[PDB]
Amino acid sequence: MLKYIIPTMMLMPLTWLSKNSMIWINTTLHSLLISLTSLLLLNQFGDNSLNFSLTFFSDSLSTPLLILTMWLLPLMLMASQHHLSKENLARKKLFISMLILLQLFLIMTFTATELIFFYIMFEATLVPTLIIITRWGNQTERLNAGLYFLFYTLAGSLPLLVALIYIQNTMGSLNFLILQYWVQPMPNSWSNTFMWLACMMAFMVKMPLYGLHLWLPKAHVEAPIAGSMVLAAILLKLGGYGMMRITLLLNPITDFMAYPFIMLSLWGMIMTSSICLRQTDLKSLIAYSSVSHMALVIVAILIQTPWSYMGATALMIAHGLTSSMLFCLANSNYERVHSRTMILARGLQTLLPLMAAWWLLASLTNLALPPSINLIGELFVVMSTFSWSNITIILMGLNMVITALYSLYMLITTQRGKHTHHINNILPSFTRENALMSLHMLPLLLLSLNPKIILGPLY
Amino acid sequence: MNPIILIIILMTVMLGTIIVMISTHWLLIWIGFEMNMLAIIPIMMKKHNPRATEASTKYFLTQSTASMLLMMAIIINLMFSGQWTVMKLFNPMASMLMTMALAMKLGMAPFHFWVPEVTQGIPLSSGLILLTWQKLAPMSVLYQILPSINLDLILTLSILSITIGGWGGLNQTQLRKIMAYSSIAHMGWMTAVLLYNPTMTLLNLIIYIIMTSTMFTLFMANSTTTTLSLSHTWNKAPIMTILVLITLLSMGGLPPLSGFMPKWMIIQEMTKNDSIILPTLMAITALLNLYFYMRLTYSTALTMFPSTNNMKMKWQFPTTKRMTLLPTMTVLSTMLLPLTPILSILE
Amino acid sequence: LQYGPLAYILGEKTTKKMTENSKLITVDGNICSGKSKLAKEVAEKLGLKHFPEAGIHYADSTTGDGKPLPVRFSGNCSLEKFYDDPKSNDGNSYRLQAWLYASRLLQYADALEHLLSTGQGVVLERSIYSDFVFLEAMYRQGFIRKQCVDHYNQVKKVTVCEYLPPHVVIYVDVPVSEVQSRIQKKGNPHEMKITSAYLQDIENVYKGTFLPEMSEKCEVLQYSAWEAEDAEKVVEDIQYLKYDKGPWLDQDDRKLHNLRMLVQDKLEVLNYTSIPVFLPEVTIGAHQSDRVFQEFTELPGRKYRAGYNEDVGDKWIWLK
Amino acid sequence: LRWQEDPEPEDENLYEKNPDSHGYDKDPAVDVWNMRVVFFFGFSIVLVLGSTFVAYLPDYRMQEWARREAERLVKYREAHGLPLMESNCFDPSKIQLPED
């Protein structure tokens, strides 16, 4: 995986030696080249993962998250270069360096063969994200949002550190490839109950679990646009990736440890979706919708059936692209009206028709319109949860009502109705902005042609 | 002070600590501690104001009481063993008295009550000596008597130090008291792994000395003793805000920094010995240390507090202070975690 | 550095050059006392180095190319706007006063550095011991607030205590009427707006607070407007002083070494001019500070340390 | 009053100084070349050649093989009268059960 680590590190002298007008173009160009190179990871096999070395390996779970991670960096550079135009040159290079460092930490988070190196990268991703939120966020509450984002995560993750070192001392290894073959069943005891909580609660915070999600409608809201893109599209998915790696070791106790948390998501996705019906802040609506979508991934990983893991990894990739595009649309209106209040700028289809078409497409992917991979992941999770217990379709189907009802309300409040009279700085859609919307939406639509690459290791 | 006299007195401080490190007789251990205290008293009274005299009086009283308890532990060892070898002690009463005396010298809780006072009362260089060099000799004596140290006492002192150094720094704005409560918490972390693996004790001591030396060197280079004067650094020297950012994120133990290195290794040695509750509660308590580190980074690096007008004069003058080993100590206190298996050199 | 503890060990004692003519002399007087020539006159009879009275751009003269910086980078304050609007809203009065105090502190550090490095005495014009006499004269006119006087007193209390007072304070008696006559003969359109009460308050804090407190810690000399015109009488009075007061007498090589290590570290000298006391006359917000700092870095010879600027033609930078 | 603060700067319109702006940069040559870099290396390179690469993956996770291999095995066991699949994955001769 060193053929992706070294170009990502060479992005640092590429941005610190570029000319002062050239640091966006060069980083965008070569991060798109790294994203083009990322497709070589699709050398996957039906039985064996692509096992590079003692340190790095990539199965069909890590591979779509790697492609999405390496694709998200140029899109974040395009999204973030407008509001940092008057920024100091060295602080601009520090911002780009934090994004590059975050990509570097993520692409060897997903390919970490051994789990304590997974933990070190998984918690190394906090520091650039924390710095981006608390340094280039816009409002006063970015500092409190950074504190919440840091301290839910560490309070979750330090028992994970203790539990992973315990697995190291007991099983002798934390290689995932070794632990595929040396995994011992985990019986019913209180020691194994807190073993399960220590192995799971960090990823429960990072998904986020409902009830532990409180960091997110601050951290996703107070961040700048590149911070919201990487938090929604990649950094929530570290929790689901780590759950799919760690629930190998947690059988068969998971079959009765999952019961509270499944409830916490199956009711919680009803609640947060309902919360999206009454959000006045558009960016907070997208944050609570991210919680609502990741609750299904939490249920699908806890019920641990093949259809559930396939729908969970499809829904993770699909939600990455969809929520990243939704935050970019919300920023494209924030760069004009300078307020995140959704009721302020109305009737924008009269003023920006092509941008309203992008709003329509991202809303339809948010509400899981078939045959998008949003609907593929949504549908496979609903199939597996119906096979889990037949009553859950109620909480699924009711969810799919409310998920429509905030997605089109977001489409109706912002784009439809009479336009606001006193707002007159509504510029036409820049080419950078429409390029950003298309570079989100067009891969999300092309993946419906060949969805088998985003369906995990057990397609 | 006469610079020759300063050199001779600092060589006498170093001579006392080295005599503690190399001697095989308990009287020379006690002599090295006496020489160390006697020579470090003028370093604390370098500026001659009543706070330095108060700090030196408090330091003298605590170290003198610890020296008397140390000599009583030595004399009870001579009772029950008839010899003087600096090794294990041959009585649990002498072991308890020596562990109490060394906890008083290190300023571990509940004998911590002198450390945030004295460090506040003295300059930054003497506070650097007190929080880095003055730990080396008692940790050497604790290194050599660990077959006799009571487990319950050393872990009680450790967790009480970690919790009290966590809660003490949350209420502070003075930087020296922040470094002092950081000292109390880190000495708790060092003594919690002493009876399990003392190589990790030496590792934690070395990484702590590097990070504390970096933070005191930054505070000397910017001439800041308070939080709110440290927050003027971005308008005076923007690189120093980056350095205090990465060093304070290291001292909280965030990966991938090197200050994550000791405590992780400490947990790596405490779970082998079937202790799971204790390093977990220690690691959760270290979030308090990380919280007031994050408070300092929000004041200094990640925001811009309002400055004054006279700062514009200081823009025309570069720093003439000898920032000794500051790039070296900054690199070592941040980017050393990929070299974590170097710790075997401390075995 | 050039001087340090090692130079003190290797024989450079400062009393080997401290001769009888190594006297720090300060000339004081009201706004048009005519003392500005007298200072130079004393400095051309005793062989002393004359420092002109530090304006806003003294630090601009000591650093860089020596040319005055634009007013947003140095000062952020106008003496002429103080003469026009003394009770201004933006607080130019106390901002000008605090900048002038920091400028006089830098000048006094330079003067002690020259005295302790060469053994040549320095004639100053209105040193830091005689700066508060303007502050009170502003405060008694309602030009500044009480909180500004509190900020000034905190800065002065933690700064002036680290220095030695001058040997000689030469005061010039010129009354308010003759001061106004010389202001009107000067013809400066801003300076002619100075009120009678402000000049009278300058004279009152001179004669009632400054000169009594310097009468213990040095030897004050006081001349009228016409007996200050004869410089040789003043130099005769200076050369026959029997110096028996002030803390210059208990100064060995160690204390003066500590003082020389102080007055060559200019950021250490200017440490407490920017104390974090948030006062609206001196507090600059983060955006203005960021903008003015990034503009100051782009000035020629100002981006790097002084020997490291190719844009002014520094060579051998890759070996320095 | 309050301190010395720069006022809120007005928002720039990129179309005023450059009505042909693509919204990347205020320098029009830098703006147009940033447009060309994004459109070429994003759409002409990663999207088109990327979808061509994904469209011709060499039997991604050996599914097609597993079809054709199954077409062997069924043809072997429709012909030899065998059942299409055993209920036991492993041979019951090579399994020791715990006795009771």
């Binding site: 970015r142 | 209420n171 502070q172 704005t173 308070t226 507090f305 | 948030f278 983060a286 | 309050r2 809120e8």
Partner: peptide
């Protein structure tokens, strides 16, 4: 519209004897 940076009210919280 520009980035929030701390005021005097934020900064005086960090300037007392204690926190």
């Amino acid at each position: 519209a520009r980035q929030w940076q701390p005021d005097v009210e934020w900064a005086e919280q960090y300037g007392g004897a204690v926190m």
